[PDB]
Design a protein around this ligand. Sequence first.
Ligand SMILES: OC(c1ccc(Cl)s1)(c1ccc(Cl)s1)[C@H]1CN2CCC1CC2
Ligand SMILES: OC(c1ccc(Cl)s1)(c1ccc(Cl)s1)[C@H]1CN2CCC1CC2
Lengths: 330, 352
Amino acid sequence: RAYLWCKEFLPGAWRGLHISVLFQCSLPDTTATLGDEPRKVLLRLYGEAMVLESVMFAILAERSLGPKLYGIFPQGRLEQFIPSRRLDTEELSLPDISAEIAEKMATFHGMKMPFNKEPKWLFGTMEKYLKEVLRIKFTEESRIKKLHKLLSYNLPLELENLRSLLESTPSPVVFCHNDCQEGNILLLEGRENSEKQKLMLIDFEYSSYNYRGFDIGNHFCEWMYDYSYEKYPFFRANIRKYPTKKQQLHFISSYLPAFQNDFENLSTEEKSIIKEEMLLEVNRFALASHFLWGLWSIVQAKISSIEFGYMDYAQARFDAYFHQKRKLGV
Amino acid sequence: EQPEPRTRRRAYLWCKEFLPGAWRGLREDEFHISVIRGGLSNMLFQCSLPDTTATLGDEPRKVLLRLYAEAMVLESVMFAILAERSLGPKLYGIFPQGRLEQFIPSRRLDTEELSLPDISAEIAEKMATFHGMKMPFNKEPKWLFGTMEKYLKEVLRIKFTEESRIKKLHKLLSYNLPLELENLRSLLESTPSPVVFCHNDCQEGNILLLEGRENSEKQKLMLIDFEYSSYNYRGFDIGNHFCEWMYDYSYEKYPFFRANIRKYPTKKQQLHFISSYLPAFQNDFENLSTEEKSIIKEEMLLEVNRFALASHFLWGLWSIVQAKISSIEFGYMDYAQARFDAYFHQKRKLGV
Ligand SMILES: OC(c1ccc(Cl)s1)(c1ccc(Cl)s1)[C@H]1CN2CCC1CC2
Ligand SMILES: OC(c1ccc(Cl)s1)(c1ccc(Cl)s1)[C@H]1CN2CCC1CC2
């Protein structure tokens, strides 16, 4: 099946003619490349709505901000295989890494995409997941209990509180990644010694026009979560790992001149004003990351096959939401 | 011509939501929209900012709205890629009901303009550029015979009710189309042709003569409407274009087309076309020997002239199917006969 996708969609030596588990499709080591065709490709089997993700991946491939698109078919797609590794959670805090993510995020934000520019994504998704959460019934007594504790916060009332806080919080609408976590950041092989070009932002499943503060606040929230933990619930949460004001300022001091052209040419006092207001903007939007992903995770506990403690994760996001509300005095 | 109130409201919402700058804060009463192309399939509209409104950034003053089975996914990706490589109109917005694309001030070429040496040479260069494209689609040349077999299977099942359509179908069927498809298959089997990304409908109605550029000898045209595009034999794309010289679709009375076999390009006109196509396609071409260049050229004429037979066959079958399924007024059965008449005339000329 994959043999016929790689044979029919790929040029040169493939048109004549190895697979590993996502799939790593390759040509034999003794086979000589006829031209610029790839020796090793990546196959993505799935399992509007595909029209938008496809056009987006095609555009990012064309603009070199994503992996190349080699083939597109109903069952999935053939993409460029990038020799790399994903970053770990502890590396998000590294100054060079943090500064590069901010630059790669700033670049992604300035991109013009053929999608709805109305920032509906944030609240529309939260309402969609909230409507589902209130009608979910679990069979297991342990899950019924965990849900009962989450529903006890009165989620529709909390959403209206978050709505009022965010409406009185100006944040520009940009093309957001919406999932800027370590698992979506590639550390490029060989390029490890590069100070400012060793990374790549990937996996645009959630990308849309959204409030800038959500992409930044959401990334700040991601410093607290490590999804590599090998024992149940298959994640580790650490509130103390949220960026300090200094680490948050280092991130924005790299984000701002990379996004706003004039920024560098402003006065020291003016630069601090934009920055101080930006810390308020992103820390408020961090609350929407906890809320969005917390609701998402309850819906995921009901529908997903994947081995992950979804209900514990929802509780860890809701704990962080209330902790962050307290920190902000909101 | 103004659209229907429901269309005008939906169009206004798509423009204010997908288009940036002055569009984001436009009132319904400030929205300008007019029909470009009517019908039921692919309605076209020009949408615009009032002339009194200033632009804020680099947003367009006017756009084209195109108002329309996952062939929609591939078609959308194709338009996006071509828009990115500056080979098609810019894509401003994609939604289930349609697209917002760049408005290009121009007119389409007329059939008579295809023969013009400068026009012909430029079409050859843009077609050659189009063929050098790497697209993420199936590279097996299954389009041609797959489409023809698909149309033929449909044609063998067709039962018309109108007496003249019945009589016309009887004549076409009498040629023994399945047997004729096999004769065509074996002829093309012994005709080598490189598999490239083809337009597959490179006719006058899909070529834009760009406004202001009518003095630019080599850069005044643009190929558009890539709905039939796929990986196909290079022979087809060129052969199909040569067949298009014979058909004028602007005829205002039924059958809504004029066919003239004498308008097919002469060896001279074909050689002029392939003489612009070849250095545009390989770039090292001019530096080859006179005997090698003449051999490449003579093999190329034979290849495109044989594939022209598949152009006649494919559109003749498509036309019969359209007579059954389409709602658009066109003399489809007369058009099918016109393509089959040409097909047998081209067979006799090739001595095959
Ligand atoms: O998709 C996740 C999943 C976590 C657990 C799952 Cl089961 S899917 C990640 C994808 C890849 C990772 Cl590595 S973590 C997380 C990343 N963000 C979106 C959804 C999750 C919370 C925030
Ligand atoms: O699309 C057509 C149509 C003709 C009649 C129709 Cl009804 S659609 C053209 C569109 C615009 C033209 Cl100008 S010709 C023709 C161009 N090629 C594809 C189908 C037709 C034959 C070859």
